[PDB]
C-alpha cells in the first residue's frame, strides 16, 4: 500500500507531465497521495498562471465577511458578518493596516503559534467565494477555469446527463482569515492555486480517519451536533492542532506559498489560515474514484449549509433516498 502513514506528498511535475491534468491526478494517487487528504503540486519552472498581478485592484469584493469567533483559543466557532463592498485595492490597504497586518514573527512556526494563541481575539475580514478567475485564457496547463466539469464526469461514468455548471472562485485573505474544518460539497476534490501574496497554512485529516474527527467535533460542539447530524457542513468549527493531538486525531499540516497548487481529496477534512494579504483561486472537480464518495457523502438537511444550484443533481442522482429531505433543507 503506497503512503501507508498518510503523509502529505509534494510533487514536481515536469512541463510534459503538466499537460494532462487527469493523468497527473491519477499518477499522484498511484503514489498514495490521496491517503493524506491533501497534496502539494509545485508547477514546472516554465509555467505561469498569467503575466502579472499589477492590474487586479479594481476587482470588487461585493460582500466582505468579518469572521467573528466564539469559544476558547483552541476550540471555537466563527460567524460571518457581512460588510460593505470594497475593491481588491481597498481590501489590500485594509489588510496592510496596523489593525489587520501580520505581526512580526520569526518563521512560519512562530506565526502558527501566534495564530492559535490569538485568533479568537480578533475579527479579520475575508473576501471569500467570489466567482471569477485570474488565469490567463492562454494558459493551457492547470488552468482552473478550463477543467473538465463534474457534470461531464458524472455523465461519462454513469451515463446520465444533468444540469449544472462548475466555475472557479477567488479568495482574498488577510492575516488570521480562517477556513473552518470541512470536506467539499458531496465529498468532491478541490484544487487551490495561491496566485499571490502571503502563505496559507493547511491542516488535514486522512480520509480513512475522517470519522474520528467527526466524533471529536460532536464532543466539542455538543449543541451544534444536536442541531444537525452533519454540522461540519456549516463550515464554522475550528479545532487546533494541540487539541487534535490531545485527542489522538491523526492529521498533518503544510504551508502553501504563492505559485503553488494544493489538491484536497474526497473526504479529506481540512482547515487553515492565511498569513497576510493573499489571493487564491479554487474549484471543485471529480474523477472516477470520486463517485463512490459522492454516493456516501453526508448531508446537512437542517437548513444551515445552503449550497449551489449544481449540488441538486448530484444528490438527486447519487443519493435518491436522501433527496427529498435534503431538498426540504434547501427550501
Ligand atoms: O482557501 C480557503 O479559504 C479555503 N479553501 C478550500 O477549502 C479549498 O480550496 O478546498
Ligand atoms: Mg482590476
Ligand atoms: Ni475546501
Ligand atoms: Zn445542518
Swiss-Prot record:
Organism: Homo sapiens (Human)
Key words, A-Z: ADP-ribosylation, Chromatin regulator, Dioxygenase, Iron, Metal-binding, Nucleus, Oxidoreductase, Transcription, Transcription regulation, Ubl conjugation, Zinc
Record: residues binding Zn(2+): 228, 234, 300, 302
Single GO BP term: double-strand break repair via homologous recombination
Portion of the full-length sequence here: 11 to 341 of 523
EC number: 1.14.11.66
Protein name per the record: Lysine-specific demethylase 4D
Gene that produces this protein: KDM4D
Domain JmjN: 8-50
Reactions catalysed according to its record: N(6),N(6),N(6)-trimethyl-L-lysyl(9)-[histone H3] + 2 2-oxoglutarate + 2 O2 = N(6)-methyl-L-lysyl(9)-[histone H3] + 2 formaldehyde + 2 succinate + 2 CO2
Residues the entry annotates as binding 2-oxoglutarate: 126, 192, 200, 235
Domain named JmjC: residues: 136-302
Record-level GO cellular component terms: blood microparticle; chromatin; nucleoplasm; nucleus; pericentric heterochromatin; site of double-strand break
